[PDB]
Amino acid sequence: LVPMVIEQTSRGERSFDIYSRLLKERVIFLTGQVEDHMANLIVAQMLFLEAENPEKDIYLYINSPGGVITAGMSIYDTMQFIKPDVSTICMGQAASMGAFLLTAGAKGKRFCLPNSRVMIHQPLGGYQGQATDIEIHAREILKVKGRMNELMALHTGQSLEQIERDTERDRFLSAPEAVEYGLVDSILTHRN
Amino acid sequence: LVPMVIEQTSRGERSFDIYSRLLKERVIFLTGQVEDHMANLIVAQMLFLEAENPEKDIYLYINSPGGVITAGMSIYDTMQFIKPDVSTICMGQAASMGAFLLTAGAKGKRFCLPNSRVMIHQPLGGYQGQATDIEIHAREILKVKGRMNELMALHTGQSLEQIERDTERDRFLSAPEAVEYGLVDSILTHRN
Amino acid sequence: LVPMVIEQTSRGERSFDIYSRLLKERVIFLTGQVEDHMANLIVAQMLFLEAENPEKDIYLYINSPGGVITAGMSIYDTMQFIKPDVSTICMGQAASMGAFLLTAGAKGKRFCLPNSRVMIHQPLGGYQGQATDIEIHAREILKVKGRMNELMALHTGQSLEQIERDTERDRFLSAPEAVEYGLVDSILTHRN
Amino acid sequence: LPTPHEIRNHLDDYVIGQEQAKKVLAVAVYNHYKRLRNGDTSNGVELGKSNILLIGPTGSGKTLLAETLARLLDVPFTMADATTLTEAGYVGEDVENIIQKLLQKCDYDVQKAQRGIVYIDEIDKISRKDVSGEGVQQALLKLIEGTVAAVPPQGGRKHPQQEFLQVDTSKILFICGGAFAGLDKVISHRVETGSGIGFGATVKAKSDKASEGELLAQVEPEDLIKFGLIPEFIGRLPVVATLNELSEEALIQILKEPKNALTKQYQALFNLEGVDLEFRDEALDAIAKKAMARKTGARGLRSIVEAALLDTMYDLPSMEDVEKVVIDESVIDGQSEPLLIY
Amino acid sequence: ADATTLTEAGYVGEDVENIIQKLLQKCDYDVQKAQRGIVYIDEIDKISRKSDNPSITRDVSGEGVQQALLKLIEGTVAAVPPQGGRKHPQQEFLQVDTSKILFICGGAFAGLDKVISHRVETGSGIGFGATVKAKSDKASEGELLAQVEPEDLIKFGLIPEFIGRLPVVATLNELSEEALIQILKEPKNALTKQYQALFNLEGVDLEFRDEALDAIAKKAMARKTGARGLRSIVEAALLDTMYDLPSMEDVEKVVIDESVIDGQSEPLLIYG
Amino acid sequence: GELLAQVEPEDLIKFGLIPEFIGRLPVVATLNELSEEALIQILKEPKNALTKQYQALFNLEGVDLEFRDEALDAIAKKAMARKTGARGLRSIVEAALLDTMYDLPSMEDVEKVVIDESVIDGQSEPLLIYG
């Protein structure tokens, strides 16, 4: 069950869900496997906040062991398109897609908790069929890997060749290492 | 089914569920397996209470046979991050993750019931695949154990060597024994 | 489904479920197997009632074929902790865990129906794995058996040796036999 | 006639802080009196009334400012609570009773009542969601702009066998003051850029309450609309003032800086008998700290000081050869009694 | 008169007949003069019903006031005390017939525009079956009010009998920058003219600029405070100016610029 | 009494009183309901004491009236439960002595009357001295 909270206002008392209440304050939650159904929900939350205040920054919490690449592209392209700056915070873990969206936030507004974990790896996909058909599918996964690395390099600031070598095989970066690698800018160790 | 309770306020009478009513009093329930969904819910409740009044302590009831580590670290880092103190209370059982969060409470504000049991054990994980990939995952879990053991010693106050040896194997600590170990400051038996 | 009832108040009529209406009268229902989710729900109700009126009594109806012990110990400690006296009533059946809660009721406020069944048996559990791991887990359950029997003897009033002998095997005690054993204080047959 | 600076210095003698607010009141009163005094209106242009709005938290001395202005002038002054007022057909409280109170202050003098300065307190707690609510405010509409009001002949209960006098409120200045709770949050969302309930979002844990007062200074009509006030009332009040809250440093000033200061009153009482009274700086700071800790406010300060001096003033007339009384931190806490000089 | 104060007979609220009593005061208790007098009523929308069609309980402040005014507007004898019932014997309550007394009602209606828009809005149905596209265009509040009809007022919470007593209906429109600009100087008792006289008596001249009025008008319509908002902006800009104006002397003229209203400048003072 | 000690003018304002009037009175004093010992003194210390009033009536009839300290304690305890103040004391005495005065003049050869604590509770009857 999702607990209920009451927001007291001059008009009067109102009831909102814990997730809904945080959404009012420009806070979006990214949790679990990334799919088309949850991505469209995040995209809608982003567009809704842009209209309310296109000058107030947005905060995105990421805690998930990756997921579908297609769904991530809809979120990544939506953050770069809207005018407000999207801040990303890594809570618990951030896999390939969770890390790509984490580093894809606005420069200077990327955070990581002290004990959070990060992981980056190349796209994983397979196809079964005719040899000619396999050739077409094989090309796409290779192209996706190249485009993903370039985008990571742009936001992280590392060289494209460096990103490719690091993403060739599973690599785990702790909170300090993430800051050093440019995935995030600082670590919110304490309130102040 | 979850029952509904009525709260009398100056503005009027409002009906809330039992879990939502306790949330108003700065009380959070941690029950069942530790996953990303339940952990993100606890984090939202913590941040919600900090905004209301970041001066009063928060009470966290823990009863769970452990779970994933990534979801737990999001709660540990959040408790230490927020300015107010988080008081942990153990009811029923407290496994590795339930004990890591129990001992992670503010010093002097940790309690355990008389019959409640505690248990501490090292991280459990496994990976299957190429020999090279196995090495990456094997080192990763080992680093998590070191980080957990270091933090465990810091909160418990015991030497790091003691934490490593005791956590090497499952160690069932009774409420009196737990106080000696330093997991909890005192045992709550009767009111006043 | 659950039916709804109406409470006639001076201001106006309110709608409540059959389980919520009885909760206002300090009545809690313990039905089905004991687990962490159902136990935490009962604990919240016990605490919620203590704040509303810490002087009036609380009635706990027990009808269940036992369950987890850790989930039950959280209820037992909660009953003895709070100031109000917890009245226990057995309806139909009371297994090992149910029997422990039933005997835990305050002195002079324990009742059972005439056609009610009670059962007391030693804790049951099993573990699989390494021989060394088996030994440590075995010690925990043995300690639980001793702790449960010691507490059972206390409330029941029978000697610890007698309790150990009787609880070694399943013992079905009828309502009259239960009174002699000391698990309860009286029997309710008709309303006076 | 007195200039705004004269009123400023006068209020400063009995008030510490609220510089911006003091300027507004002085200007308004000066302009209103010029309009009232210039009743001939030699020029074809007709002068128009002006109203004052005060926004400040509880214990901000809002009533003190109104009382000081009224004391400085010979016109009648009245205080009322908006919450008590109710719409017609209800229990019986009506807006007409407000004018009745004003007439009682001036001995039922219609001419004097017109020049009186009316004040409203606790304007909050009444707004749009039957219940009266906003309906109570609607009755005030005609009063602010100016209208004739029926009042009993000698302040008696309404009787059909009698006539009611008519008082024109077109020249009665209105000062609406109230404490708004939550308005600062609305303003913050409008002007400040924060993520509210967020991991990286700013929280009000720094304890710098002074920022709240500064935020209220940026209040606009749109913010009041969000609170629930109808746009007619916001338009009826063209002048708006903001009052910040008291601080530990400012509270220490109130203890000695005002002419009718708490410490000065006790000092005068003590030296009247011939025994000097000295208030240590540490004791004064502790008194203000205790009130802020318990949030008793400026009013509670008197009770705190009375506790320590009550025992002392009882035994002081007993003995003789007393030259000075020294209060210390221990005296405030009550661990030790104040020492005397012999 | 104030409609909110009016209530049904037999209640604490002000009686409807008291309105006629006020008219007598103006003509020195002359019944003949009052019979040909004019009466104005304000905020008549407040007495409208608020979803009170079922009539769960009688509304003395709402529907009740309308019922009482039905015959009064048409014309009938009104029993008002001449001098508040001076003596019980031979009271001789004044009988003032209102058959020839004109009545003017006025009030701001909120939501009425939506009611008119819904009626004017086309579209028989939704889906392929619909033969009409239901095309509509945005219209101003004043434009919609011009198309008002008695049926729309009934849905607002007004009795049909009541509206039937008012055959002629007149509407008003909002204001624009040009309107507000003209109102600041064109009328006799204009806002700017009032401040000029207040400064002229102190031996000080005041002047305005067209650019300043433009900013004033924009700020007024930006805050949605109507014409009354103008006063708030003017006084806020001249607050510091008049706060110390009596202190010094030798000042003959004052000039206000657009930057002064923006808050990044200060008024220019001219010394003689 | 503890709550009365921690009283501030703001509390009175909350009740619905005008603040101007509360400000004219800057000094406040608190009291407390009479206790068991206080009621005992009030019962006999005043000149027109309740006990003295009944004693005069009994003396007028020619019979002496006596009271016990133990019985007086119970009367004070009952008054506290009723929390009706000093006036309630008269009611308590009237209830206990109702049956006595009804048949008091009927009896003869009575010189003194003694009242016990149990008589106040109603279980016992008033003792009469015959001689």
Ligand SMILES: Nc1ncnc2c1ncn2[C@@H]1O[C@H](COP(=O)(O)OP(=O)(O)O)[C@@H](O)[C@H]1O
């Ligand atoms: N700025 C101030 N200067 C002097 N006294 C003040 C000031 N603010 C508050 N006070 C004191 O606080 C007391 C109560 O103020 P109060 O009328 O409650 O303020 P408000 O009307 O804002 O609640 C007054 O007696 C007054 O002396």
